[PDB]
Design a protein around this nucleic acid. Structure first.
Length: 370
RNA sequence: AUUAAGACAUUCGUGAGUGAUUUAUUUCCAUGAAGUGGCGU
């Protein structure tokens, strides 16, 4: 039937998950490139597809080449005809091969024990404060670009009011304790180094395009690994290997573990995130892509949200795999993890319906909440 | 096939130029070539 795996990635060296105004972008190519802390789920999909072809010896080698029909059909049945695409955001099927669903990438801490792994999540933006939202006729009201919404009274749940100077919840990641949420600073998880690189020969070149590039390489602290859950169609197999995930040939180690069958991985991820639940808000655990933010703000009053940029590399089975890849023509803005959507009385169901209507994005571990 | 791939912080560069171990300082101070006669009553 279907087969469920847990896939742990261990950084062998300093990795580089980059992208936005990255190098070789032109328009002041901006040699200084900073690494994103996580890869896009598209990178996860592509890595899975690349390794699936590696196991079956179906990769493209040598300069521009061709394909015979039967290997084309086996690539169809294994990986799919087309990469992760934003245009298929409302397709009810993943449009790929044996891959059905992947959980959002999760940060996992591996203590030196048989003891289980602690799952670390970004700290909710509302953690530490209470939002009361007093609404009995006009007593206070705010317009967000021309929409009526209640007033967000925010107090430190410890009265005073929200001092943005004290606000440091965006710098923390959380995990479950006995009954205390364990807060970890982002620096205690990711260490960064700036690298200076040049081309030695020196030929005719112009700045941002000849030499002298600086890249941010991230290292993940000792006992921390990246993980996700995958469902495969059952006629394939995933083998432990050494992978390339990210930019500048960032090399990782796959440990593929088979979890017991009949296990919906979405329920597993939500069980992991259960300790952050609050009855009055929806916690965004992974980037979300509501097609109308004004529509969402209609039913949510205070959206304690941030934004991340998403851009995808678009390739098919027959594409120049050695060349400037085709990037997604549109830049897609996603809701940062840890974002808080505060809804009206009731009305939770149709905002959840708006969030889950992107079933293709739900399957690629994006619009996940708790 | 993954906002990817490719790229030595490198090429040129003398720890060198100018600059007396020189200036000041009596081998000097004290000091008798001196002392005494002897016998032959």
């Amino acid at each position: 039937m279907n087969r469920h795996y847990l896939i742990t990635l261990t950084p062998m060296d300093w990795f580089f998950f980059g992208g936005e105004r990255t190098l070789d972008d032109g328009k002041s190519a901006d040699y200084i490139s900073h690494s994103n802390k996580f890869p896009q789920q598209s990178a996860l999909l592509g890595m899975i597809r690349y390794q699936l072809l590696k196991q079956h010896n179906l990769l493209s080698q040598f300069p521009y080449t061709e394909n015979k029909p039967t290997e084309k059909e086996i690539m169809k049945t294994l990986i799919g005809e087309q990469s992760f695409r934003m245009t298929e955001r409302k397709a009810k099927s993943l449009g790929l091969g044996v891959i059905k669903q992947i959980s959002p990438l999760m940060l996992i801490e591996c203590k030196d024990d048989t003891s289980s792994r602690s799952i670390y999540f970004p700290l909710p933006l509302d953690d530490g404060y209470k939002v009361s939202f007093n609404e009995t006729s006009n007593e206070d009201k705010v317009f967000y670009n021309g929409i009526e919404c209640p007033i967000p009274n925010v107090y430190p749940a410890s009265r005073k009011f929200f001092d943005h100077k004290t606000y440091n919840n965006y710098l923390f990641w959380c995990t479950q304790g006995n009954n205390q949420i364990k807060k970890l600073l982002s620096d205690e998880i990711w260490i960064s180094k700036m690298q200076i690189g040049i081309t030695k020969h020196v030929e005719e070149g112009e700045d941002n395009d000849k030499s002298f590039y600086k890249q941010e390489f991230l290292q993940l602290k000792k006992s921390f690994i990246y993980a996700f859950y995958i469902t495969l169609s059952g006629e394939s197999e995933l083998s432990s290997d050494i992978i390339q995930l990210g930019g500048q040939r960032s090399v990782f180690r796959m440990e593929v573990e088979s979890i017991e069958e009949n296990s919906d991985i979405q329920e597993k991820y939500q069980t992991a995130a259960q300790f952050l639940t609050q009855s009055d808000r929806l916690l965004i655990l992974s980037p979300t892509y509501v097609d109308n933010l004004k529509e969402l703000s209609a039913l949510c009053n205070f959206m304690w949200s941030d934004s991340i940029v998403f851009r995808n590399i678009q390739t098919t089975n027959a594409s120049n795999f050695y060349g400037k890849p085709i990037k997604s023509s549109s830049k897609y803005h996603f809701l940062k993890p840890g974002s808080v959507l505060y809804f009206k009385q009731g009305k939770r169901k149709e905002v959840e319906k708006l969030l889950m209507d992107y079933t293709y994005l739900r399957l690629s571990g994006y619009n996940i909440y708790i």
